[PDB]
């Protein structure tokens with residue numbers, strides 16, 4: 001449950017991401033994969049990436065980063081009214097990709113890390129609070145769908 005002012009902060013922060021969705025998406029995934037190498041194993045199409053240099057050079061990783069952040073941005077712009085947008089992602093990530101909710105926590109924190117890394121001094125405490133709450137809401141609603149599906 002975010003206030004109007006918190007959603008305003010979220011969407012203000014998101015404008016930073018939308019200016020360079022592929023660069024943000026790439027860095028989010030690289031942060032996820034390098035911080036939590038087990039997550040790489042969930043991607044048949046990225047498990048060949050042995051080094052961060054290879055990850056950085058991967059155009060397909062940037063492409064997927066764009067897909068991920070485009071989806072997330074579409075969800076965030078719903079300001080919590082995202083059941084229709086979230087449902088297929090929860091279902092695909094539980095049933096097809098088999099992504100534990102822990103990895104969604106990892107990527108949520110990776111987003112925060114990337115925002116500070118790319119916008120140092122420009123991702124204020126209020127913005128971090130609002131973005132964190134929005135990612136918690138996202139993760140929590142996914143978690144509810146995971147529970148429905150019995151997925152761990």
Ligand code: HEM
Nearest residue numbers: 039042043045067068071072088089092097099103104107
């Ligand atoms: C912000 C959180 C995430 C968003 C918005 C997101 C979004 C997406 C989207 C839109 C797709 C393609 C459509 C689909 O298959 O449903 C996808 C595919 C996929 N996602 Fe995610 N995802 C997120 C987090 C994760 C995490 C944390 C993992 C694993 C650690 C993961 C693993 C995968 C895999 C393996 C695929 C299939 C990739 C392929 O083979 O093309 N996702 N994701």
